[PDB]
Homo-oligomer: A and B are copies of this chain.
Amino acid sequence: GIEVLGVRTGPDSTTTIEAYLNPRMGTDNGFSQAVTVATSLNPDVPPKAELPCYSCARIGLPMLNEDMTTPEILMWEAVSVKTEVVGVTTMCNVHSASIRMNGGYGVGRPIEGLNCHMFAVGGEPLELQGCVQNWSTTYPSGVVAPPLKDAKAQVLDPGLKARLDKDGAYPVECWCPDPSRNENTRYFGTYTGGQQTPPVLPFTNTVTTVLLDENGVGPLCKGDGLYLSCVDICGFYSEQYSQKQHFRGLPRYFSVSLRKRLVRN
């Protein structure tokens, strides 16, 4: 929809935005509540404190357009991002009361099992497609879940759409980034499943992701807002005694480089 013109250069034509997003694993400090499992598909009633959710934030950018009626206006364009999962080294902890290896004689199992890592940078909220494993699930009060009127919600029902517009409220397991939308967002996601799978987590300050599309255009920040989204499920913590499991998530740092872009109003 937007006719993109030339990059605007000169003093104060570029800025770097730094932010971090703390994980929303179901409680505030990096872990879900002990996860409970239904004995059948119905009733299946996951409590809110047991459901990892997407993290998201809108960063206000410097105001560009005193007059919004001119035939051309300026927009902040996200050119590149350096992003880092913070606290990776915490998973070298094998002393804090996990299930012990070597039949109880060795160290605690580290955080391990399914991993799901996603970050997104856009000029508007991340657009979501609803999809669930079990259409009979009762999602709790306090989360935004797709309506579940029939089993088509287990595959692609094009009626089930949302915008990631609240931090710690959209459960990861019932929403994915919508590939049919997000023209103005770049999202990067990986899932590695299995039971006791080793997490593989890099940490470096040397890797830049370019956000420019095929035509050399980055996300354009509507209303001078930059939208950051992520989830970083790093696996499960097993309690030594109960052997109950908790989702473990880690915070994510973002450094986004932006430039002014002229567009046709």
Contact = CB atoms under 8 A, between A and B. Distances in A.
Interface of A: 18, 20, 22-23, 28-31, 35-41, 44, 46, 50, 52, 82, 84, 86-103, 105-114, 116, 118, 129, 131-135, 137, 151-152, 154-156, 158, 172-177, 179-180, 182, 185-206, 208, 214, 231, 233, 235-238, 240-245, 248-251, 253, 255
A205 B185 contact: yes
Contacts of A231: 89
A143 B24 CA distance: 31
Q: How many copies does the complex hold?
A: 5
Contacts of A179: 82, 84, 86, 203, 205, 253, 255
A88 B105 CA distance: 26
Among A94, A194, A241, the one with the most B-chain Cβ atoms within 10 Å of its Cβ is A94
A132 B90 contact: yes
B95 A174 contact: no
A201 B131 CA distance: 15
A241 B87 contact: no
Given A18-B180, A93-B173, A187-B203, A152 B29 contact: yes
9 contacts: A22-B152, A35-B107, A39-B240, A87-B131, A92-B172, A105-B243, A156-B253, A176-B203, A182-B205
B106 A243 contact: yes
Contact of A195 (B88, B155, B185, B196): B196
A131 B193 contact: no
Given A91-B114, A158-B20, A188 B173 contact: no
Nearest to A253: B179
B173 A89 contact: yes
Contacts of A193: 91, 110-112, 198-201, 235
